[PDB]
């Protein structure tokens, strides 16, 4: 199963030479510095950066790149990918489900699950949880373990692998590679970018690319980087580790004859030769979008202190604004009562949805490294996860402030006139929560997109209608007050509820209104305030908050299709 | 420059058993696991942990722990703690400053600090920025090197010290470790427990403590654990690194016997007979605060894009708001732009000091390490920080706002019918701010500080005054009312723009008010709300919140001065 | 309460004008909005501004900075300063007098007829 | 602004017939719709406040309708006295504007 490479020239500015070399079956391995040309020639070797950069010919047992290549090559990410929620043998069912072909019945699928839990020993956990930050049944030694498997149900013949032992040690380290020396004859061709490791895993390797400063050193066998360094001039520390003691020369023990010293030894043209020698999705939409809800459901319940957490607290404070605004007298007391709790209302559904953006930021790593293999599309990762996590956590504080709060403060008291409120409470909630997925759709830190969220979330509030009379703002700026989700909330809210009433005790102000400076009745209010009386005044309020999701949306799925996926 | 110790059972509940031996001048280690016991014997034998937990006696040269001990010890700890935004001149002369006696003057001082940075080469450096987020002039290879000088201006005889290489690697990892080695016979006992070393830093040592599980295990010379575990029988893979082999028997190679089978060695005996041998605030509080004060604000301005930032940000909303209210006509519209913009404005002082949180939560590792040294007195570097931070970076805000705004919106144009308004605006940001101090004054993560303060500071607002009726809440809710700070800065804010005002064009009800619905004037809706009038009823409202600063400033004293030191 | 209209029968273009409207029977400082309403030759009427019981005035926004009115409220009257004129607003200005608590121009002057020409 | 239009800008009606004249706003007024009686050479004087009320020193047959926006005035049985212009006034905006008034011809 070799992987004979040839000149990758790689260029970002250059972060590569021309490397040769390849990689034939055993256990091959990628030394180098902490970050010279290591990593990035392993990214490179296993399709994951973007090809204009890359100029030269990489093959695959004498086959160029065929298309579908990650298709039957596995790539385990250094830091952990798993989903620790879930549990062990779910992951691995996940991981099933997506990435190999569907023609096959669900029974052989788990046949092939228990024989690669049994050729990856787990049956000892095989249903424990893993578990990020409030349970943590597992530990690391099998974090990796599985980490490893769930590339492993598809079997293919090239497992690329970076870093397998950076966060574990000695114990669980020599275990883990131990298991990589022997499920790799198998005829599996590892190919791994370790960091200083010992001598105790320096057994067997058969390979190793010592590569320093974005250009090869050496690429013989295991038992030859000691000879070549002993014909370079070099004890190597009678006894010490050389696999630091090759490092300890590339520091400071000076470089461009270090690397110029090989292409004259023998093993440059030993392989060169054999090199000229040579030298002459898979599912549906439905699967993809029915097993991604599944796992983000379920992951939603599996560490619930996040989720559930803010659902006590919205029913805390629904129970709390209700025994505040109890009464909602209708006395000159019950103008301000009643703007001021549906203003509440509001600007709360919107700033509690900025709590939502780590729907997307949380798991870009994850994202990524699903899509560049073939998983899933883009499209089917976008609705799964909202028709999961979004639909389903803003649809109940809509639903509890409105089933609490109505009937505590005795708000106009009809059918409809309580749905149109539960109702627009959850149109403001999506169109909030959508504009804080548009916002935070690519980024990686969360501290930029919190901070203008909650700026623009400000300026929205000051823009909302209670604030300041919206119709006494100058000309150049009235029309800053259509880009604002809570005016459009509030709004609604407010001709929703302020239409029949008469906030003046005494004094029948509807057939005409004595002193004309009173606000003796509803419409008096709502129409000084700027705001329609027709039906359409408030669904209009609605058609407006319908755009702004779809639009909101398509710029979400649009960050993500664009994003750079290498 | 001995450091005898003996028999330290440590209690927290275990984390020590009976360890004994004797660390002679030279450069004595502590290898270890990662951490079984390693860095809670090198903390317990540093007076690094409080003593009620500690059952044994330790020794110094054969004086039992005078009493100034960490007068003449330092301690350098893992991770770096030198101020990033200051100088590397500037960080010695501030560890020269509070610590070494002030009866020499300051000629000698920078004598000494040139004498350091000599013995300690850095006149490579020797002014240049450290830096932490926004500029990065020296690497790791200088921070550590000046960590380790900044405790060498007293000169200590015991130079304790604790992961030196923890995150840095071969090259300024061998230049540190043969700096140590050169720099110890001057005379100076280092005692450091490092982490998985190398042999070509295993050269010299005179001493090591292989100490796991709570037990120690080995402590005999360089030179001897070699020799010891040949004699215990074990090959030690002939070649390796022995430094890993160590921690390669204690893994997994149990325990019981092998803590058991040294006593009975030579070693034991060996030390334990020289052991039952020997058996039988410096300165002001004018220093103290004139330092921490300039260190403080020196390093404020280090890296400007923190606070500068949000300056922009408040000079921005000062001017977009002037903009908005710009007429502030008095008719109908006039209560409520002027009720609305007064809100927002106290609504945002609070707010906005949410982020002078991180004044004691980003430092916590500092001020902790600085005061288990002979650093100084915690009164001295609460008033400091208080007066280098808080003071003048509260006190511009305030003076943005109120001198942009108040000719814009045009409000009551008097003098002290200003100043009282920018003297408000102080106060309500000192008084929040300082609750925001006294909640975040202990802990070390901010997450949980800042969620309980915006919930904190949003049931304020909810209580503030303009989304409730004050009057209208039962009445066993009505004393709630009086915790809350937008209420005292809202209030004092009314009523020093409402008294003179009349809100109704063409009706003078100055005389009498027709028709008694109207709030034709600010006294009537200034009392419709439940505020007083007279003198008193605005200056009541800053005799409050003079207090809850002084409140909320002495619960963070006392938190800071009952936080566990050790 | 009773007011009166009285000024200058002409003025030519870009030059100003004034109308001094003497109120009499009601101190001008004591209770109502004080207003200018002006009537085209078409017979259609545009508001122009008042000026407040206390002194603050609010003048009609298609009357950019033209018109300033003030109130020499020792013999109470109050004035019209109407500034770069047209030689279009040749109208009748009928000095009308708000209520406020009712809402109404209860009481109007006589108005004069202001001639805009050569 | 408020455009206040009384889209029958003139009439002809006779010695008694009931006579109405219709001013549509062009927002939202809330019956604050007052009318003027212009006569032929005076200053205007106020007929109906609030667009329902009347005017002490007025005959009964005036009276207002509406609301809304269509606001209607309704002379009942017009006498010799009732000619010149009627303008319709709204007074809830900032801008007080009129309307274009509508003569009355005598057949």
């Known amino acids: 199963a070799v992987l004979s490479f040839h000149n990758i020239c790689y260029r970002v500015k250059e972060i590569l030479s021309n490397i040769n070399g390849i990689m034939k079956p055993g256990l091959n391995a990628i030394l180098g510095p902490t970050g010279g040309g290591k990593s990035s020639l392993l990214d490179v070797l296993a399709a994951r950066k973007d090809p204009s950069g890359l100029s030269g010919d990489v093959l695959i047992n004498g086959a160029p790149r065929p298309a579908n290549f990650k298709c039957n090559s596995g790539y385990v990410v250094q830091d952990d990918v798993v989903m620790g929620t879930l549990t062990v043998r779910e992951n691995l069912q996940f991981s099933a489900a997506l990435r190999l072909a569907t023609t096959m019945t669900n029974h052989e699928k788990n046949e092939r699950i228990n024989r690669v839990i049994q050729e990856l020993g787990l049956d000892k956990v095989a249903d424990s949880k893993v578990g990020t930050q409030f349970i943590r049944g597992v530990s690391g030694g099998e974090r990796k373990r599985t980490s490893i498997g769930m590339e492993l149900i598809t079997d293919p013949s090239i497992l690329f692998l970076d870093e397998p032992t950076t966060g574990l040690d000695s114990s669980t380290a020599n275990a883990v590679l131990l298991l990589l020396k022997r499920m790799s004859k198998q005829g599996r061709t590892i190919i791994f970018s370790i960091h200083q490791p010992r001598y105790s895993i320096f057994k067997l390797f058969d390979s190793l690319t010592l590569l320093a400063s974005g250009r090869l050193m050496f690429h013989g066998p295991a038992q030859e980087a000691l000879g070549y360094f002993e014909s370079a001039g070099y004890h190597c520390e009678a006894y010490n580790n050389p696999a630091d003691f090759f490092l300890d020369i590339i520091n400071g023990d000076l470089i461009e004859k270090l690397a110029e010293i090989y292409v004259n030894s023998s093993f440059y043209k030993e392989t060169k030769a054999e090199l000229h020698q040579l030298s002459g999705y898979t599912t549906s939409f439905c699967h993809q979008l029915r097993w991604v809800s599944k796992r983000s459901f379920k992951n939603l319940l599996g560490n619930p202190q996040a989720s559930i957490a803010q659902i006590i607290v919205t029913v805390v404070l629904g129970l709390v604004i209700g025994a505040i605004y109890f009464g909602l007298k209708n006395d000159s007391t019950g103008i301000q009562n009643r703007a001021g709790v549906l203003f509440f209302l509001t600007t709360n559904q919107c700033f509690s949805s900025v709590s939502a953006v780590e729907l997307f930021v949380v798991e870009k790593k994850l994202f990524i490294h699903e899509y560049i293999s073939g998983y899933y599309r883009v499209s089917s990762y976008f609705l799964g996860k909202l028709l999961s996590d979004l639909l389903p956590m803003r649809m109940l504080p809509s639903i509890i402030f409105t089933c609490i709060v109505y009937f505590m403060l005795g708000l106009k008291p009809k059918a409809d006139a309580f749905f149109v409120m539960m109702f627009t409470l959850m149109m403001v909630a999506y169109s909030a929560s959508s504009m804080a997925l548009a916002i935070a759709a690519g980024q990686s830190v969360v501290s930029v997109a919190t901070l203008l969220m909650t700026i623009c979330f400000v300026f929205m509030m000051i823009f909302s209608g209670l604030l300041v009379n919206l119709t006494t703002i100058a000309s150049w700026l009235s029309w800053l007050q259509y880009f604002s989700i809570p005016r459009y909330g509030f709004t609604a809210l407010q001709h929703n509820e302020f239409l029949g009433q008469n906030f003046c005790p005494g004094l029948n102000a509807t057939g005409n209104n004595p002193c004309n400076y009173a606000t003796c009745t509803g419409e008096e209010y709502l129409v000084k305030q700027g705001i329609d009386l027709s039906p359409w005044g408030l669904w209009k309020n609605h058609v407006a908050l319908a755009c702004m999701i779809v639009i909101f949306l398509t710029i979400a799925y649009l960050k993500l299709l664009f994003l750079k996926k290498y | 420059a001995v450091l005898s110790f003996h028999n330290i059972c440590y209690r927290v509940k275990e984390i020590l058993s009976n360890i004994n031996g004797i660390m002679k001048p030279g450069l004595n280690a502590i290898l270890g696991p990662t951490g079984g016991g390693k860095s809670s014997l090198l903390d317990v034998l540093a007076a690094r942990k409080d003593p009620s937990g500690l059952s044994g006696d330790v020794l110094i040269n054969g004086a039992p722990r005078p009493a100034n001990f960490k007068c003449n010890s330092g301690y350098v700890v893992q991770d770096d703690v030198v101020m990033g935004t200051l100088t590397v001149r500037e960080n010695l002369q501030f560890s020269a400053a509070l610590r070494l006696a002030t009866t020499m003057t300051n000629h000698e001082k920078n004598e000494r600090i040139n004498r350091v940075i000599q013995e300690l080469g850095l006149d490579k450096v020797a002014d240049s920025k450290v830096g932490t987020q926004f500029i990065r002039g020296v690497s790791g290879g200088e921070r550590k090197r000046t960590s380790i000088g900044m405790e060498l201006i007293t000169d200590p005889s015991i130079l304790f010290l604790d992961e030196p290489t923890t995150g840095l690697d071969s090259s300024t990892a061998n230049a540190v470790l043969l700096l140590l080695k050169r720099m110890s016979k001057q005379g100076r006992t280092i005692i450091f427990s490092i982490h998985q070393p190398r042999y070509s830093i295993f050269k010299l040592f005179d001493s090591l403590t292989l100490l796991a599980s709570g037990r120690l295990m080995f402590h005999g010379p360089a030179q001897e654990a070699l020799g010891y575990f040949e004699s215990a029988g074990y090959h030690c893979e002939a070649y390796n690194n022995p430094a890993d082999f160590f921690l390669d028997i204690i893994n997994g190679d149990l325990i019981e016997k092998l803590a058991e089978i040294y006593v009975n060695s030579s070693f034991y005996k060996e030390t334990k007979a020289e052991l039952h041998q020997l058996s039988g605030y410096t300165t002001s509080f004018c220093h103290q605060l004139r330092w921490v004060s300039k260190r403080s604000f020196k390093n404020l301005l280090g890296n400007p894009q923190a606070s500068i930032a949000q300056i922009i940000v408040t000079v921005v909303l000062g001017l977009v708001i002037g903009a908005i209210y710009f007429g502030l006509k008095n008719d109908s519209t006039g209560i409520q732009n002027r009720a609305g913009v007064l809100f927002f404005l106290t609504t945002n002082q609070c707010f906005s000091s949410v982020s002078a949180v991180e004044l004691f939560v980003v430092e916590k590792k500092l001020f902790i390490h600085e005061y288990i040294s002979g650093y100084y007195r915690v009164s001295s570097y609460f008033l400091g920080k208080l007066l280098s931070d808080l003071l003048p970076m509260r006190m511009l805000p305030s003076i943005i706002f109120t001198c942009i705004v108040y000719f814009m919106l045009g409000l009551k144009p008097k003098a002290d019918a200003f100043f009282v308004m920018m003297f408000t605006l102080m106060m309500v940001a000192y008084s929040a701010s300082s609750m925001a101090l006294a909640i975040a004054a202990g802990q070390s993560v901010v997450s949980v500080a800042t969620l309980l303060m915006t919930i904190c500071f949003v049931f304020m607002m909810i209580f503030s005054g303009l989304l409730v009726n004050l009057t209208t809440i039962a009445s066993w809710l009505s004393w709630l009312q009086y915790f809350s700070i937008p209420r005292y800065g809202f209030t004092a804010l009314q009523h020093n723009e409402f008294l003179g005002q009349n809100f109704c064009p063409g009706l003078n009800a100055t005389g009498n008010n027709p028709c008694n619905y109207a709030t034709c004037t600010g006294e009537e809706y200034l009392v419709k709300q439940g505020i007083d009038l007279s003198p008193w009823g605005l200056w009541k409202n800053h005799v409050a919140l003079a207090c809850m600063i002084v409140i909320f400033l002495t619960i963070a004293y006392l938190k800071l001065l009952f936080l566990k030191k050790y | 309460v009773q007011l009166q209209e009285s000024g200058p029968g002409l003025v030519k273009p870009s030059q100003s004008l004034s109308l001094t409207c003497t109120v009499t029977?009601?101190?001008?400082?004591?209770?109502?909005?004080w207003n200018w309403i002006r009537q085209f030759p078409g017979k259609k009427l545009e508001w122009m501004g008042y000026?407040?019981?206390?002194?603050?005035?609010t003048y009609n926004p298609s009357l950019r900075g033209r018109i300033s009115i003030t109130r020499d409220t020792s013999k109470n009257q109050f004035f019209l300063q109407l500034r770069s004129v047209t030689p279009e607003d040749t109208a009748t200005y009928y000095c009308?007098?708000?209520?406020?608590?009712?809402?109404?121009?209860?009481?109007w002057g006589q108005g004069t007829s202001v001639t805009v020409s050569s | 602004d408020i455009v206040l239009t009384q889209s029958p800008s003139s009439f002809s009606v006779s010695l008694g017939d009931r006579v109405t004249i219709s001013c549509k706003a062009s927002?939202?007024?809330?019956?604050?719709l007052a009318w003027y009686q212009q006569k032929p050479g005076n200053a205007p004087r106020l007929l109906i406040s609030?667009?329902?009320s009347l005017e002490t020193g007025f005959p009964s047959r005036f009276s207002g309708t509406g609301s809304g926006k269509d606001y209607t005035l309704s002379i009942s049985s017009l006498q010799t006295e009732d000619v010149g212009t009627y303008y319709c006034?709204?007074?809830?905006?900032?801008?007080?504007?009129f309307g274009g008034g509508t003569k009355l011809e005598i057949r």
């Open positions: 927002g939202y007024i809330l019956n604050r």
């Open positions: 029977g009601f101190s001008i400082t004591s209770d109502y909005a």
């Open positions: 609030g667009a329902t």
């Open positions: 006034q709204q007074y809830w905006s900032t801008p007080w504007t």
């Open positions: 000026i407040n019981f206390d002194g603050g005035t």
């Open positions: 009308a007098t708000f209520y406020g608590a009712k809402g109404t121009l209860d009481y």
